[PDB]
């Protein structure tokens, strides 16, 4: 299958700086087919670049696209604050129209460790089916993280989603909610649940756990 | 009926130029691409270009730039491929074909280009005669391809087997065989009508016993 | 340029039975494979289109699968009227390129050629040429040779040979050889026979005629 | 000046049919193909087909040959996909796509790039029908406490469709508050938390209430979150 590879997944830079985004496709792309979009939170994608060299009605200069073949670069000489959003590459010169995964432009800023919280199912929540247990990581940098969870030291797999904020718009930190869910059942049957941690700022994981 | 109507044969001398066309009908030729397509005799096929009424464009293979140049007449419905400075090799059988949009769905009959120095030359169509009898026609030394063989009109469509032509000094030479029961010939007329349309030549020649 | 590699070349099935050709590309091109037949003197018919599709009109016994660089087309219950060639095409970029091609023939029961030899003609012969015509039709495997005998010697030069293609009804060969000599080498010999060895008969089928008739 | 103008949200049951569109006003339509894209949330775009304005003739994606279908109506400047036999994984935002102006070439391809996207349409795929939600309280205790900072919130569980605004004190609470996105679950329902940090000292003499609205079910809910 083609495949366009988009290097570095996220890119952490501050405004004014040079930002260099990689895209290497698994196969030669012919007459230089490639495509850049942005896609700012929450809204659609826009062109940026098309051909891999040429700016699109409306786009500032200091966005630049090179490349061919196998290797193409998005590159922006001084980054302005609106500039920092998702981008990702396209090649048309197939039937496919194969996208990349995307490189996410953030603010670079220094490491934050995580502020871990557990929060234990709510008595009230008993009485349906289930039972939510809610884990806190707040106000840290990197987004890079890892939620693990244990009950009796068992670590739980396929039943606890996770959800993140975006980066704070005035200390550039991120937050993620981890929430467990188990049934009434499965609940009151086990003791101990833990919420275990991975992250840069951190030496070793920490845990929060508490029990019934 | 979706039909696209090439151009006869065509002869031409090495390092000149040909121009066929391609009318289409049953459509509107403006609303679809037209693709040009190259089958050299017992070899594959080869994508030539297309044409695209709607937004006036074209395309090229690599292969054929400099050699093909494709254009249209949006008022006749009519899309046109000349080839210039041939050669022996861009001898072939050129198809136009309707794009859908770029596969290609309906194709043209076919037009056959031969690049040489010979000059035409009609066939001499001369009767082959002896429960089922079988009679034949020879087409010899005629130039160039191709030639079309009927009997009766048509009506005699099976029991019939027409042979691909052999090249020798510049010449074709054909053969079509048609069976028969012993009833109708000779009781009945059995004639073979053949066709050279690059000659514009059109011969019956009714065949007889002895 | 995206490379279409096409196979086998050539194939013999019998009737029921089922055919299966391939066509591996040098690149991914999504599932943009098109099926053509191709019967002899007419242009290619499309069968099958981008997606797998198999076209209105056409048959319920073709059909196609595959993705990315390996396809694949196959006809169930195979006729005697599937005896063609077939092109796979790839619409998906630039240059659009064919296969090689797969010449699909039938598997039939032997059968004997059913030879007829003609004398030349008072036309030719006023021209100044002659031309001893044999039939061989209808004959089945393709393999086949023609021996010509002038007054009992074999002769080999001056013979044009030319085969058709598999008839679509019963998927049988003929063959016409051309034996063209000088008027007055025509008029110094009086046998003329044409001999059609097959593996039908170890005995030759034989149809001569002499220039007194 | 090109607009693209997509139909509204929709909401299908798994195994139903839903069909797009999207309306081309400041050009001429025919002249310009129409591509689909998708894109789930936080995951990549992903090409569907493009359709011929002039003259229909379309092209799909293998990955869903058999289930997508565009049309197109040219009388009112509008294309159309359809995309049958939903599954969960189907919700995502739906965008059409204008190509770009035709500026020569070889390939048909020099101008297939997205060159004018619209807004999106969201298609979501559950068998659930409106529903309001269920408010839990986090309650703040040891284990939600860091220094003189305490975390307390409320979990906003099984509703659908979403949004639902979340504040604290009737908006009189902004600081410290992270409302995070809307989760959906594997029962189909919407699942968030709103969590809000606060001086621990200032606990026992604080009110802290959270205040969930939920239009599409025509519910408010508040709920005080206390330490137990
Ligand atoms: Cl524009
Ligand atoms: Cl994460
Ligand atoms: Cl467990
Ligand atoms: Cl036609
Ligand atoms: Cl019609
Ligand atoms: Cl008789
Ligand atoms: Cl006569
Ligand atoms: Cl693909
Ligand atoms: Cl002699
Ligand atoms: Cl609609
Ligand atoms: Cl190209
Ligand atoms: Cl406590
Ligand atoms: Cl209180
Ligand atoms: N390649
Ligand atoms: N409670
Ligand atoms: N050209
Ligand atoms: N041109
Ligand atoms: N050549
Ligand atoms: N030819
Ligand atoms: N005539
Ligand atoms: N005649
Ligand atoms: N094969
Ligand atoms: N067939
Ligand atoms: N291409
Ligand atoms: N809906
Ligand atoms: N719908
Ligand atoms: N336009
Ligand atoms: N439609
Ligand atoms: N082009
Ligand atoms: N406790
Ligand atoms: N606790």
């Known amino acids: 299958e083609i495949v366009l590879t988009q290097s570095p997944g996220t890119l952490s830079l501050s405004p004014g700086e040079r930002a260099t985004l990689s895209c290497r496709a698994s196969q030669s792309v012919s007459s230089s087919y490639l495509a850049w979009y942005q896609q700012k939170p929450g809204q659609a994608p826009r062109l940026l670049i098309y051909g891999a060299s040429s700016r699109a009605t409306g786009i500032p200069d200091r966005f630049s696209g090179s490349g061919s073949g196998t290797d193409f670069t998005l590159t922006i000489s001084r980054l302005e604050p609106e500039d920092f959003a998702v981008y990702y590459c396209q090649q048309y010169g197939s039937s496919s129209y194969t996208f990349g995964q995307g490189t996410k432009l953030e603010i670079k800023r220094t490491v934050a460790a995580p502020s871990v919280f557990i929060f234990p199912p709510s008595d009230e929540q008993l009485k349906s089916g289930t039972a939510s247990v809610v884990c806190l990581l707040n106000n840290f940098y990197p987004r890079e993280a890892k939620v693990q969870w244990k009950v009796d030291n068992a670590l739980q797999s396929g039943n606890s989603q996770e959800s993140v904020t975006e980066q704070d718009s005035k200390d550039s930190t991120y937050s993620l909610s981890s929430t467990l869910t188990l049934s009434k059942a499965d609940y009151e049957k086990h003791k101990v649940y833990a919420c275990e941690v991975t992250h840069q700022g951190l030496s070793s994981p920490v845990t929060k756990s508490f029990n019934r | 009926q979706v039909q696209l109507q090439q151009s006869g044969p065509e002869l031409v001398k090495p390092g000149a130029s040909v121009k066929m066309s391609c009318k289409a009908s049953?459509?509107?030729?403006?609303?679809?691409?037209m693709h040009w397509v190259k089958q050299s005799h017992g070899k594959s096929l080869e994508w030539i270009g297309y044409?695209?009424?709607?937004?006036?464009?074209?395309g090229y293979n690599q292969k054929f730039k400099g050699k093909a140049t494709l254009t249209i007449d949006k008022s006749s419905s009519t899309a046109y491929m000349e080839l210039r400075s041939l050669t022996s090799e861009d001898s072939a059988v050129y198809y136009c074909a309707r794009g859908g949009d770029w596969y290609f769905d309906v194709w043209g009959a076919g037009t056959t280009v031969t690049v040489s120095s010979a000059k035409t030359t009609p066939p001499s169509v001369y009767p082959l005669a002896p429960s089922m009898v079988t009679l034949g026609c020879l087409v010899k030394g005629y130039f160039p391809e191709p030639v079309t063989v009927t009997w009766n009109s048509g009506s005699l469509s099976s029991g019939v087997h027409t042979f691909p032509a052999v090249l020798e000094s510049d010449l074709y030479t054909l053969s079509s065989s048609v069976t028969v029961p012993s009833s109708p010939r000779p009781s009945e007329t059995v004639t073979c009508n053949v066709a050279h349309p690059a000659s514009s030549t059109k011969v019956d020649k009714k065949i007889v016993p002895r | 340029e995206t490379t279409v590699t096409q196979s086998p070349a050539s194939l013999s099935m019998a009737i029921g039975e089922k055919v299966t050709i391939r066509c591996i590309t040098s690149?991914?091109?999504?599932?943009?494979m098109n099926w053509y037949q191709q019967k002899p003197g007419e242009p290619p018919k499309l069968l099958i289109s981008e997606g797998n599709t198999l076209r209105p009109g056409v048959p319920s016994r073709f059909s196609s699968s595959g993705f990315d660089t390996d396809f694949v087309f196959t006809i169930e219950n195979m006729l005697s009227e599937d005896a063609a060639d077939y092109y796979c095409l790839q619409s998906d970029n630039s240059p659009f390129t064919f296969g090689g091609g797969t010449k699909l023939q039938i598997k039939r029961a032997d059968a004997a050629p059913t030879v007829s030899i003609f004398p030349p003609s008072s036309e030719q012969l006023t021209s100044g040429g002659a031309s001893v015509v044999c039939f061989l039709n209808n004959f089945y495997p393709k393999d086949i040779n023609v021996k010509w005998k002038i007054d009992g010697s074999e002769r080999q030069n001056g013979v044009l040979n030319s085969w058709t293609d598999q008839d679509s009804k019963d998927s049988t060969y003929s063959m016409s050889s051309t034996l063209t000599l000088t008027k007055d080498e025509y008029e110094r010999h009086n046998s003329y026979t044409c001999e059609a060895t097959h593996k039908t008969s170890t005995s030759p089928i034989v149809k001569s005629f002499n220039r007194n008739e | 000046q090109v607009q693209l103008v997509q139909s509204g949200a929709e909401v299908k049951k798994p195994g139903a049919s839903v069909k797009v569109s999207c309306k081309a006003s400041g050009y001429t339509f025919t002249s310009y193909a129409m591509h689909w894209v998708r894109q789930a949330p936080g995951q990549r775009l992903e090409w569907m087909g493009w359709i011929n304005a002039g003259n229909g003739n379309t092209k799909y994606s293998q990955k869903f040959q058999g289930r997508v279908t565009i049309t197109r109506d040219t009388s009112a400047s509008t294309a159309y996909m359809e995309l049958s036999s939903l599954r969960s994984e189907d919700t995502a935002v739906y965008y059409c796509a204008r190509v770009g102006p035709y500026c020569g070439g070889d390939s048909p391809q020099d101008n297939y790039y997205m060159d004018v996207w619209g807004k999106g349409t969201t298609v979501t795929v559950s068998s659930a029908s409106t529903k309001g939600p269920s408010v839990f309280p986090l309650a703040p205790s040891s284990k939600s406490t860091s220094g003189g900072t305490a975390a307390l919130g409320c979990l906003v569980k099984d509703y659908f469709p979403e949004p639902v605004t979340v504040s604290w004190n009737s908006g009189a609470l902004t600081s410290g508050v992270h409302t995070f996105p809307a989760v959906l679950q594997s029962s189909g329902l919407y699942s968030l938390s709103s969590v809000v940090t606060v001086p621990s000292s200032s606990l026992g003499t604080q009110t802290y209430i959270c205040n969930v609205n939920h239009k599409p079910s025509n519910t408010k809910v508040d709920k005080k979150v206390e330490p137990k």
């Open positions: 044409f695209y009424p709607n937004n006036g464009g074209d």
């Open positions: 690149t991914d091109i999504d599932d943009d």
């Open positions: 049953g459509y509107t030729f403006t609303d679809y691409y």
